[PDB]
Amino acid sequence: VCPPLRSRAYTPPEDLQSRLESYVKEVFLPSNWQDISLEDSRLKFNLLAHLADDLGHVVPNSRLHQMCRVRDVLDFYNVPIQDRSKFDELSASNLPPNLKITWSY
Amino acid sequence: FVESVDEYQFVERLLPATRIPDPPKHEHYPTPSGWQPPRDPPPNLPYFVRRSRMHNIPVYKDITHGNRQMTVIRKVEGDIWALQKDVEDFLSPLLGKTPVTQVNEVTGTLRIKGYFDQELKAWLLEKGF
Amino acid sequence: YRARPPPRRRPGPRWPDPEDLLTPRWQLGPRYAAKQFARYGAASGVVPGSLWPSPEQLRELEAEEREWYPSLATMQESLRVKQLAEE
Amino acid sequence: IGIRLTLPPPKVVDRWNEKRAMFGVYDNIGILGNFEKHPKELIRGPIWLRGWKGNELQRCIRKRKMVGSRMFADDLHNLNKRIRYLYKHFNRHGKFR
Amino acid sequence: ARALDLLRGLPRVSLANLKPNPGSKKPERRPRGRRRGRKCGRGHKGERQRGTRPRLGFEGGQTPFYIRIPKYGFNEGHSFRRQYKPLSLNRLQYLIDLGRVDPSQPIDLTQLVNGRGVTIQPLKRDYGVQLVEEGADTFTAKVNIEVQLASELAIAAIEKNGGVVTTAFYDPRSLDIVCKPVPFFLRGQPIPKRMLPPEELVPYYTDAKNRGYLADPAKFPEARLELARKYGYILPDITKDELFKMLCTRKDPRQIFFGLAPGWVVNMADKKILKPTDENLLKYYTS
Amino acid sequence: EPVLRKVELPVPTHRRPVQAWVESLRGFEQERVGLADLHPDVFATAPRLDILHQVAMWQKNFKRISYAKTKTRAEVRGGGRKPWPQKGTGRARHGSIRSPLWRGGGVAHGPRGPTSYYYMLPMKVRALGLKVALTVKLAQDDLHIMDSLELPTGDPQYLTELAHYRRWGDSVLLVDLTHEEMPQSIVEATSRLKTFNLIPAVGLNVHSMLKHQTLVLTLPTVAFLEDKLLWQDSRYRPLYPFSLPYSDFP
Ligand SMILES: [Mg+2]
Ligand SMILES: [Mg+2]
Ligand SMILES: [Mg+2]
Ligand SMILES: [Mg+2]
Ligand SMILES: [Mg+2]
Ligand SMILES: [Mg+2]
């Protein structure tokens, strides 16, 4: 049975650095954990899979190679993505009173 | 009448290879033919010039109309514009004017008006590509 | 859908029936058999002894060699007599 | 009046029938199958132009050479006449020399 | 690369997005409209507009240029002239340096072709490879090379480096087999005898100054010393070299490949070599 | 246990292998069962859409044989005699009733016989087209790597629902290594579907990769494609067709 479709909307959590460093400690320690290199496949998979399970939002294959460091992972996860259609993006954008938009699709 | 045998080593010797062999390690460079492997590690320039499948610098003379002489640096990766700036800086003292060039960003090539294949090959060797 | 099975070369030697009129004449001679043996070896079923010339073929080859390819001694003698005549 | 007064019956195309869906499959049979088969061997058509291309004269010459003996009598006569005409046209007519 | 990030931004690449590279598709010109119609680029009435202008080379009745010039034997016998692809010492050194040709083994036309150092076309009357002195002053390889022609300077360079060079003849059939042995092996034929040089070429290949493969080996040291004296280098005693056996290895004058005798059949399918034992066949293939 | 794939072939020093999630078809949620390193020279080449167009057009047109044919004035029935004399009738001059000007006459420049459109791009160009298509799918997030194509069931509804849940495209091209070893479950599931098409690795091509919105590859297919496409790089100029024996070529 198909589960309810996962909404692609994602708002980065406020305690995101804390959660990320907790996961980094769980997976891997030294000072400046931002600069920990993910050249190891095991460690990269563990960290990214944990983050994907926890936040409901995975790094796409296209961006997977540019996650060279925990800093890169943090940058990827602190950028929001909204799944609202263009209809919503326009209508909920403070339309002037003389502008009317309707969608029949 | 028929006598089979296994002297097949002399046939394995005749079988040709489909893959270009990696050049053997030489004690001293440049090699007697002038060839030189790319330096390890690669230079940290914004651009990289990959060797040809025969392990030579991809710099080629080209000619059109019988009078338009050009030189092409072909297998460029990264900042082709940085490479163009470097090539202009390196070639302007030789010409006395900034060389006229075309940057094919799509194909990753740089085309320079005039023949500079030898100078550009030496220059790329010095840069370590 | 599922793709149809990929096209492949017919495995092993291909022996056309000589009785058929539509089989090309080049697929019936000994050269075809020799090529089949070279391509598939023992699996061809070609008797290896047939690859070498039969005694009549060998006699023809020897006659052709005697006729057209002189020995090194004969060539040297002809060159020597030509040089002597020129001198 | 050279225009139809009604809309033609709608033309429905199934973009995902088996032929369209599997179009192109095995076009790389050579470079992905150790070159056992050439992609031109995938071509189905007249025996005289499988994996081959030419102008009309070359096509007609090839057709006569390869299946001329199997051609019907008047078809072969037409092909012979066509080859003769095409020879004259391609070797004696035209803007260029 | 930034281009792949741009792709990530852009819509899906499909069969509705494809466009040829600009400049790779010239527009088709067809004779319709004011500019390209009417007379359609053919001009006013005449032979050229009718399409019936006379053949190329016709000059309107004046005796044509290509006929009023006297016949001269520039190309007489062109298809029977022997051609030899040049292999400069520069090219040989380049191949050895890049490892495409292995100097530790005897170098023959098969090895040159397999390393792609030379391209031989027996159908175009190539009779093999000629060694070329170009690059002699920088040749520093010890090699045992078998060529068809060799210049005096090329021989001198090869021998000064401590190597050996021999000029060996190949008839067109043997040459084709040597250049592409695998197709010959797939032909399923016994390896034929290498024919002797034609009478005109016999003195060349029996002369020791050319290092001919049919020359008296007794005269080789004298010729080598003469070259060393002429070109001012000390002749190295290759017998002392540890690779002397390789440098001495030479195929029999009737032998196409180094380790294969005439008459053998190479079964590549099961990695075997069938050898005839009939006395008549053995005599023929040894003759 | 993560399924990690490393790049078997040597990678250029200045380049780092690109990466993809190894997924599974065994469950709707099994979107990350491993991590695969893909060769950048196959999966991170330059985005040559022009080369994609070249290869796609070659695929469309090289097999084409048009069977359209018209009769010329020589082949139309009849038309031997001159209809009327040159002068006297007051009518236009004509030589046969089958000239192109006439109703029922020949066609002056119609299609002529079965015509082939056959041509071959260089095999290096065709392999490069395959590489570019793979890089494009990966960069646009249409490429999904699977450990295997094994399904819990051969029900097509399961496959369609799995694609819908994982937000795959309307069309999926699943590629398995060889025809024989393809799992029976995926074979049964895809045999009944129109937009989910399953092909062997040897059947991969630019046209089908572009027709299908998403491309699903197994790890053996990834290794196989890397080997085959990278072989085109660093290969010699052929001495004879590669079907013939070579020292190092299977
Ligand atoms: Mg050019
Ligand atoms: Mg005008
Ligand atoms: Mg007119
Ligand atoms: Mg006029
Ligand atoms: Mg008629
Ligand atoms: Mg009609």
| Closest CA–CA distance from residue A57 to any residue of chain F (Å) | 11
Residues in CB range of F69: below 8 A, 6 or more apart: F110, F111, F112, F113, F114
Kindly calculate the radius of gyration of chain C based on its CA atoms and give it in whole angstroms.
Answer: 24
Work out whether strand B2-5 and strand E272-276 pair parallel, antiparallel, or are unpaired.
antiparallel
Query: CA-nearest residue of chain F to C9?
Result: F243
| Closest CA–CA distance from residue C7 to any residue of chain D (Å) | 8
Q: Cα–Cα distance between E157 and E232 in angstroms, integer?
A: 11
Chain center to CA of A31: 25
Work out whether strand B59-64 and strand B68-73 pair parallel, antiparallel, or are unpaired.
antiparallel
**Domain ranges (residues) in chain E:** 80-287
Residues on chain E touching A62 (C-beta within 8 angstroms): 4, 8
CA torsion sign, A70 to A72 to A76 to A78? positive
Residues on chain F touching B12 (C-beta within 8 angstroms): 247
Ligand nearest to the CA of F106: 6
Ligand nearest to the CA of F76: 6
Which chains border D (3 or more CB–CB pairs < 8 Å)? C, E, F
B64 alpha carbon to ligand 1 midpoint, in Å? 7
Query: CA-nearest residue of chain C to D17?
Result: C1
Burial F212-223 (b: 16+ CB within 10 A, else e): bbbbbbbbbbbb
Q: Cα–Cα distance between D49 and E284 in angstroms, integer?
A: 46
Q: What share of chain B is helix, strand, coil (3-state, %, to 5)?
A: 25, 25, 50
Residues on chain C touching B1 (C-beta within 8 angstroms): 49
Could B19 and F234 be called an inter-chain contact, meaning their C-beta atoms sit closer than 8 Å?
Answer: yes
Nearest Cα to E213, choosing from E168, E249, E181? E168
Written as one letter, the residue type at E21 is N
Angle at alpha carbon of residue B29, lines to B25 and B35, rounded to 5°: 85
Tokens of E66: 């290509």
CB F89 within 8 A of CB D73: no
> What are the C-alpha distances in Å from E267 to residues C44, C58, E196?
11, 22, 27
Could D42 and C7 be called an inter-chain contact, meaning their C-beta atoms sit closer than 8 Å?
Answer: yes
Q: Cα–Cα distance between F89 and F84 in angstroms, integer?
A: 7
Residues on chain B touching F242 (C-beta within 8 angstroms): 18
Tokens of F185: 């479950």
Q: Is the peptide bond before A30 cis (omega within 30 degrees of 0)?
A: no
Written as one letter, the residue type at E230 is K
Could D28 and F114 be called an inter-chain contact, meaning their C-beta atoms sit closer than 8 Å?
Answer: no
**Domain ranges (residues) in chain F:** 1-250
Residues on chain C touching B2 (C-beta within 8 angstroms): 48-49
Q: Cα–Cα distance between E119 and E91 in angstroms, integer?
A: 13
DSSP C2: B
Residues in CB range of D16: below 8 A, 6 or more apart: F171, F194, F195
F101 alpha carbon to ligand 6 midpoint, in Å? 12
Tokens of A92: 């909920």
Three-state secondary structure of chain A = CCCCCCCCCECCCCCHHHHHHHHHHHHCCCCCHHHCECCCHHHHHHHHHHHHHHHCCCCCHHHHCCCCEHHHHHHHHCCCECCCCHHHHHHCCCCCCCCCCCCCC
Q: Cα–Cα distance between A67 and A36 in angstroms, integer?
A: 11
CB D28 within 8 A of CB F205: yes
Angle at alpha carbon of residue F86, lines to F80 and F89, rounded to 5°: 110
F81 alpha carbon to ligand 5 midpoint, in Å? 9
Query: CA-nearest residue of chain C to F245?
Result: C39
Q: Cα–Cα distance between E250 and E254 in angstroms, integer?
A: 11
Residues on chain B touching F9 (C-beta within 8 angstroms): none
Q: Cα–Cα distance between F70 and F249 in angstroms, integer?
A: 48
- What is the resolution of the experimental data for this entry, in Å? 2.2
Residues in CB range of E209: below 8 A, 6 or more apart: E152, E223, E226
**Domain ranges (residues) in chain B:** 1-129
Q: Does B2 touch chain E (CB under 8 A)?
A: yes
Q: Does E4 touch chain A (CB under 8 A)?
A: yes
Q: Cα–Cα distance between D94 and D86 in angstroms, integer?
A: 12
- Using left for φ > 0, alpha for ψ between -120 and 50, and beta otherwise, residue C13 falls in beta
CB F39 within 8 A of CB F226: yes
| Residues 221-240 in F contacting B (C-alpha not used; CB under 8 Å) | 231, 233-236, 238-239
Task: With an 8 Å CB cutoff and a minimum of 3 pairs, decide whether chains B and D touch.
Answer: no
> What are the C-alpha distances in Å from D45 to residues B10, D79, F60?
45, 19, 15
Q: Across the B/C interface, how many CB contacts are shorter than 8 Å?
A: 3
Nearest Cα to D25, choosing from E16, F203, E220, B121? F203
Q: Cα–Cα distance between A5 and F28 in angstroms, integer?
A: 11
F241 alpha carbon to ligand 3 midpoint, in Å? 54
Q: Does E16 touch chain A (CB under 8 A)?
A: no
Q: Find the CB nearest E268 among F54, F240, F245.
A: F245
Q: Does D85 touch chain C (CB under 8 A)?
A: no
CB count in 10 Å sphere of residue A68: 14
Q: Does C1 touch chain F (CB under 8 A)?
A: yes
What is the DSSP annotation of E160-216?
HTT-EEEE----HHHHHHHHSHHHHHHTT-PPPPPPPPPTTTHHHHH-TTTTBTTS-
Tokens of E245: 């056996």
Q: Cα–Cα distance between C41 and E188 in angstroms, integer?
A: 9
Q: How was this structure determined?
A: cryo-EM
Ligand nearest to the CA of F97: 5
Q: Cα–Cα distance between A7 and A87 in angstroms, integer?
A: 17
| Closest CA–CA distance from residue F174 to any residue of chain C (Å) | 9
Could F205 and D85 be called an inter-chain contact, meaning their C-beta atoms sit closer than 8 Å?
Answer: no
E33 alpha carbon to ligand 3 midpoint, in Å? 17
